[PDB]
Amino acid sequence: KLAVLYAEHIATLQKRTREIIERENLDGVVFHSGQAKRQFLDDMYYPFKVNPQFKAWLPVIDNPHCWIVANGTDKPKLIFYRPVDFWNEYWADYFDIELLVKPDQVEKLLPYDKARFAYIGEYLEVAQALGFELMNPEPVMNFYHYHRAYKTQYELACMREANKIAVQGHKAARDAFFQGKSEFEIQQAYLLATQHSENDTPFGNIVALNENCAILHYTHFDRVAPATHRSFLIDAGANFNGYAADITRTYDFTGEGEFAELVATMKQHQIALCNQLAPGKLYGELHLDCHQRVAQTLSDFNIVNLSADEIVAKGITSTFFPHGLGHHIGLQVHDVGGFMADEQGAFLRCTRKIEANQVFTIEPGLYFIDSLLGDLAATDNNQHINWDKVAELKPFGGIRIEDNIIVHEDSLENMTRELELD
Amino acid sequence: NKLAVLYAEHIATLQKRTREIIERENLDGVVFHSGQAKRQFLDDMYYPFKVNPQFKAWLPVIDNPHCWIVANGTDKPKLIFYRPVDFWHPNEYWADYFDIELLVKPDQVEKLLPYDKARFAYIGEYLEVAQALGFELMNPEPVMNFYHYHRAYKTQYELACMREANKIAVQGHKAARDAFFQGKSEFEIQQAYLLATQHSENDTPFGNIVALNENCAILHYTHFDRVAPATHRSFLIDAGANFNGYAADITRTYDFTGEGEFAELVATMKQHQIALCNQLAPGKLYGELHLDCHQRVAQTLSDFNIVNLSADEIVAKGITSTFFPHGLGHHIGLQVHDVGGFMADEQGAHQEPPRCTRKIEANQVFTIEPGLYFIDSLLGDLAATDNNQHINWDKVAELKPFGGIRIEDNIIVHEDSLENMTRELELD
Numbered sequence: 001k002l003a004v005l006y007a008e009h010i011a012t013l014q015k016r017t018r019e020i021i022e023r024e025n026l027d028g029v030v031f032h033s034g035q036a037k038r039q040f041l042d043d044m045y046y047p048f049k050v051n052p053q054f055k056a057w058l059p060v061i062d063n064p065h066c067w068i069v070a071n072g073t074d075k076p077k078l079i080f081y082r083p084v085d086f087w088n089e090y091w092a093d094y095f096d097i098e099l100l101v102k103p104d105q106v107e108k109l110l111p112y113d114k115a116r117f118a119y120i121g122e123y124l125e126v127a128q129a130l131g132f133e134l135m136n137p138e139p140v141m142n143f144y145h146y147h148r149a150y151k152t153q154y155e156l157a158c159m160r161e162a163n164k165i166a167v168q169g170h171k172a173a174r175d176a177f178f179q180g181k182s183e184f185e186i187q188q189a190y191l192l193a194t195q196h197s198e199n200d201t202p203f204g205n206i207v208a209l210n211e212n213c214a215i216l217h218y219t220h221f222d223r224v225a226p227a228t229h230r231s232f233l234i235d236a237g238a239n240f241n242g243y244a245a246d247i248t249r250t251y252d253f254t255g256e257g258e259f260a261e262l263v264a265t266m267k268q269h270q271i272a273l274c275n276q277l278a279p280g281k282l283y284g285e286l287h288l289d290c291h292q293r294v295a296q297t298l299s300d301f302n303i304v305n306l307s308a309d310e311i312v313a314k315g316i317t318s319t320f321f322p323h324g325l326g327h328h329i330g331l332q333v334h335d336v337g338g339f340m341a342d343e344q345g346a347f348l349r350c351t352r353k354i355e356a357n358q359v360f361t362i363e364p365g366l367y368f369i370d371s372l373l374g375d376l377a378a379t380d381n382n383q384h385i386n387w388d389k390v391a392e393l394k395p396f397g398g399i400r401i402e403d404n405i406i407v408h409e410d411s412l413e414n415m416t417r418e419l420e421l422d
Numbered sequence: 423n424k425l426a427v428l429y430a431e432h433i434a435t436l437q438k439r440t441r442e443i444i445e446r447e448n449l450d451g452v453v454f455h456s457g458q459a460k461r462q463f464l465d466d467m468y469y470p471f472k473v474n475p476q477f478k479a480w481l482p483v484i485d486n487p488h489c490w491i492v493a494n495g496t497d498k499p500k501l502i503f504y505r506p507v508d509f510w511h512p513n514e515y516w517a518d519y520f521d522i523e524l525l526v527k528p529d530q531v532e533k534l535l536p537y538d539k540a541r542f543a544y545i546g547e548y549l550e551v552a553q554a555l556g557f558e559l560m561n562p563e564p565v566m567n568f569y570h571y572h573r574a575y576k577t578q579y580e581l582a583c584m585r586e587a588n589k590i591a592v593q594g595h596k597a598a599r600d601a602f603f604q605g606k607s608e609f610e611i612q613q614a615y616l617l618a619t620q621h622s623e624n625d626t627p628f629g630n631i632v633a634l635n636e637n638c639a640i641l642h643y644t645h646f647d648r649v650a651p652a653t654h655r656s657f658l659i660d661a662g663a664n665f666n667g668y669a670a671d672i673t674r675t676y677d678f679t680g681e682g683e684f685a686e687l688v689a690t691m692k693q694h695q696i697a698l699c700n701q702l703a704p705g706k707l708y709g710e711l712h713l714d715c716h717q718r719v720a721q722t723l724s725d726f727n728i729v730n731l732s733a734d735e736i737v738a739k740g741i742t743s744t745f746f747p748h749g750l751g752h753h754i755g756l757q758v759h760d761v762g763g764f765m766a767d768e769q770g771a772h773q774e775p776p777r778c779t780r781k782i783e784a785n786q787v788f789t790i791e792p793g794l795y796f797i798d799s800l801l802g803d804l805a806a807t808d809n810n811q812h813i814n815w816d817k818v819a820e821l822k823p824f825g826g827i828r829i830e831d832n833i834i835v836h837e838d839s840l841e842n843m844t845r846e847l848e849l850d
């Protein structure tokens with residue numbers, strides 16, 4: 001039951017609010033869910049995306065014009081938008097709820113003296129019209145983002161659920177790929193098994209076949225299946241109550257050959273890497289180990305004619321693994337706080353020290369990218385590359401294997417692999 | 423006939439329109455900004471991109487931010503085409519109608535624009551960006567009004583594009599209707615539709631309305647139930663399709679068993695709808711058809727004995743608006759609810775109502791969407807007035823579980839004939 005954990009979640013957020021509003025001499029904090037954005041010269045709207053700082057309090061992620069007023073001592077106030085034009089859950093009990101019928105009528109529900117209420121939201125003009133003066137003050141943002149990195153038990157439960165949903169999608173997509181479906185059909189299967197509409201996914205799914213696996217930010221879906229099937233890379237997640245999953249699997253169509261061997265080797269490394277998560281360990285250290293294991297893979301597979309250490313030393317591994325090893329995840333897919341050393345807020349996304357109750361992705365990759373390979377060929381590192389072998393693996397695109405892992409004090413919970421996603 | 427051939431005449435037409443408006447407004451030229459990607463608050467995700475309708479009026483490029491068209495109508499239009507270069511990430515028929523220049527980063531655009539921007543109209547959303555570039559004429563009304571007025575007269579290219587949008591949507595509607603009769607859920611029916619049209623959700627020109635039972639009475643229903651209802655009674659689906667920036671906008675209503683009072687109601691509305699389609703004609707005000715719809719809705723109410731009055735009495739007492747609360751339809755094209763539908767002249771003067779009021783002409787494209795609904799709120803208001811006595815509330819109660827009815831086609835008006843794109847593609 002989520003309701004039991006949720007009670008503790010509110011209590012934690014109230015505690016956090018109490019601390020920062022005392023420290024920064026405020027009366028309260030006002031969290032603005034957001035608004036509907038209208039398309040230029042049109043009467044159509046973009047899909048609504050809630051303020052992360054709003055939904056941090058409660059699973060209301062599809063409602064604009066909502067407001068939260070909290071001071072950490074009284075019950076948080078919730079202004080809940082609810083129009084009446086002809087066109088009650090467990091969390092409700094924890095707020096004093098006021099219903100709003102028209103957004104411009106919010107002004108009589110907010111504090112008369114807004115001088116010392118920090119407005120937390122996107123809409124600065126609306127805030128100033130209402131009478132707010134302090135908007136998104138850095139000390140306050142920094143403080144919340146720092147503590148967003150420690151997930152309450154409520155949040156962990158939500159994140160286990162989002163993972164479980166995503167893992168059903170990933171399996172359906174995997175099966176669809178082995179049946180030789182198009183990227184577009186694979187995506188439909190993924191949406192169907194997760195019961196997600198496209199604007200429900202926490203990010204735009206990456207569903208790639210063959211050469212497209214090397215396109216790191218690939219977003220399209222081919223409606224036409226490839227003449228031959230070689231490789232498949234799916235990076236997709238899911239939402240539960242505002243919390244995200246973010247999972248990548250890569251597959252060889254045949255299960256035999258050098259690329260299939262490459263994939264399984266990357267998988268052992270990625271599991272090894274996961275298991276190095278531990279309290280009191282700088283995340284950056286794992287990112288260094290990943291370049292080393294990637295160096296060793298390139299050497300072992302005779303993609304590069306050097307020892308693993310020499311590949312690292314000559315700066316060759318960045319050509320094949322050009323992004324960070326991972327990141328915090330939670331309410332945002334690339335979650336906040338991943339750079340902060342303290343509450344004050346003093347390439348690689350996470351450098352912060354690992355601790356209990358933090359949640360991570362571990363996503364080593366190995367790609368054969370056109371422009372990066374062209375750069376290397378121009379350097380003195382030309383002599384060392386096995387160009388014949390790059391040509392061989394090129395048609396398969398690349399590889400990424402990505403899990404979501406919760407760190408505990410004396411254990412790790414790899415959510416994705418504990419769900420038996422191979 | 424083929425799109426490539428028709429497009430040549432489309433460009434020539436846009437050039438001619440540009441020449442007249444810049445000459446009249448004393449401009450040097452017009453600049454269409456496709457738009458930009460919008461970042462989510464405190465995040466590094468983006469909203470889905472939506473192109474400036476005035477930009478895609480020129481060419482079928484709808485997924486590309488940071489593009490600019492510089493037109494004056496005499497020289498070939500200059501296209502500034504965004505094409506970034508990084509490891510993370512133009513040869514079709516329309517390309518050689520533009521003087522094209524590639525832009526590898528958005529902040530490098532100042533170079534490619536006119537050095538003196540004083541008499542160039544900026545047509546776009548990003549006012550402050552455009553000001554910083556030096557533009558000072560932001561979306562000038564005389565120019566907006568003028569382009570939006572002529573948007574009502576589709577070129578042959580645009581007509582062909584809209585026939586393809588309609589073709590694709592009709593596929594979706596057939597898959598959806600089949601899915602309905604198999605007792606599927608709203609969410610599974612929407613999936614069938616997206617499959618048949620090969621559209622991602624953000625490709626549809628609007629958010630699909632896929633409603634079962636009482637949900638059919640929620641005009642702006644947007645959710646997709648994951649759970650099939652225990653009893654299937656009714657289905658209403660309002661859904662379109664994009665082709666090259668042009669929209670289709672189709673609605674069908676179905677009864678599950680195809681027998682009974684609600685099923686006969688659908689059949690009756692269908693016949694009214696078809697009769698209203700054939701009322702489109704050059705010279706007629708679209709208002710004249712809107713009033714006929716109300717007459718016909720009043721006639722349905724009278725015949726089915728939902729209201730105990732003659733059709734004419736029902737209209738006089740203003741009762742039909744309880745059951746048909748919206749407009750008969752609207753222009754359609756680049757925008758779903760297309761521009762120019764209220765304008766009486768190029769100066770943007772308002773044709774007064776008795777949405778769309780403008781005098782109908784050849785080459786314009788309309789929706790026709792009569793509907794009849796049983797809406798709690800509106801029936802509640804009806805129960806408060808001195809028209810209480812005239813309503814059969816028992817029959818209303820029996821029909822309420824079916825939600826409502828809408829039937830919507832996209833029709834082209836020709837000088838001598840009408841072209842119902844939707845019924846031509848065999849969607850009954």
Ligand SMILES: CC(C)NP(=O)(O)NC(C)C
Nearest residue numbers: 203206216235246323333
């Ligand atoms: C959310 C996902 C699609 N992006 P990522 O954080 O897994 N970055 C990858 C491209 C390395």
Ligand SMILES: CC(C)NP(=O)(O)NC(C)C
Nearest residue numbers: 628631641660671748758
């Ligand atoms: C475009 C669609 C979603 N709505 P509509 O203009 O076809 N009809 C109205 C009455 C809902």
Ligand SMILES: [Ba+2]
Nearest residue numbers: 258261301302
């Ligand atoms: Ba070997």
Ligand SMILES: [Ba+2]
Nearest residue numbers: 299300301302
């Ligand atoms: Ba070997």
Ligand SMILES: [Ba+2]
Nearest residue numbers: 292308309310
């Ligand atoms: Ba060593």
Ligand SMILES: [Mn+2]
Nearest residue numbers: 021025026027
């Ligand atoms: Mn105080």
Ligand SMILES: [Mn+2]
Nearest residue numbers: 025026027116
């Ligand atoms: Mn005070």
Ligand SMILES: [Mn+2]
Nearest residue numbers: 235246247248
């Ligand atoms: Mn990912």
Ligand SMILES: [Mn+2]
Nearest residue numbers: 246361363402
């Ligand atoms: Mn990730």
Ligand SMILES: [Mn+2]
Nearest residue numbers: 431432434578
């Ligand atoms: Mn001609």
Ligand SMILES: [Mn+2]
Nearest residue numbers: 660671672673
């Ligand atoms: Mn419609």
Ligand SMILES: [Mn+2]
Nearest residue numbers: 671789791830
């Ligand atoms: Mn319509």
